[PDB]
Each structure stands twice: as structure tokens, then as C-alpha cells.
Amino acid sequence: DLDLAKASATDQLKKAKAEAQVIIEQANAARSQILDEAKAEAEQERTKIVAQ
């Protein structure tokens, strides 16, 4: 049972470490979408202003 301490740690540590990566990836996608949409709205404001 003592020899399972490393086993019991690997049952938690590496899985959480991997999950952190997808947690970061989803935020990365959200950031990319937010910045792209901001640029796409700013361009349509600028075009409107200059056309006026």
C-alpha cells in the first residue's frame, strides 16, 4: 500500500496538470474571438465615419 503513494499521486497530479492546459486553451480561444470581433467592429465604425 505504501508503494501506491506514487501511484495515488499520479492518479491526481498529472491529470490536473493536463486539464489546466485545456482550461488555458478555451480562454485563448475566447481572447482570440474577442480581439477579432473588436477589430471587425472598429473597422465598420471607421468606414462609417469617413463615409460621412
Partner 1 sequence: AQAEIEAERKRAREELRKQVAILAVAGAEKIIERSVDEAANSDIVDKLVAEL
Instruction: Indicate which single residue of 2, 5, 40, 49 sits in contact with partner 1 (rule: CB under 8 A).
Output: 49
- d(C-alpha 8, C-alpha 12), whole Å: 7
Give 34 or 42: the residue with its C-beta nearer to partner 1: 42
* CB nearer to partner 1: pick between 40 and 49: 49
Name the one residue in this structure whose C-alpha cell is 495515488.
8
| Using rule CB under 8 A, residue 46 touches partner 1 | yes
Pull the grid cell for residue 32: 482570440
Q: Which residues bind partner 1 (CB under 8 A)?
A: 45-46, 49-50
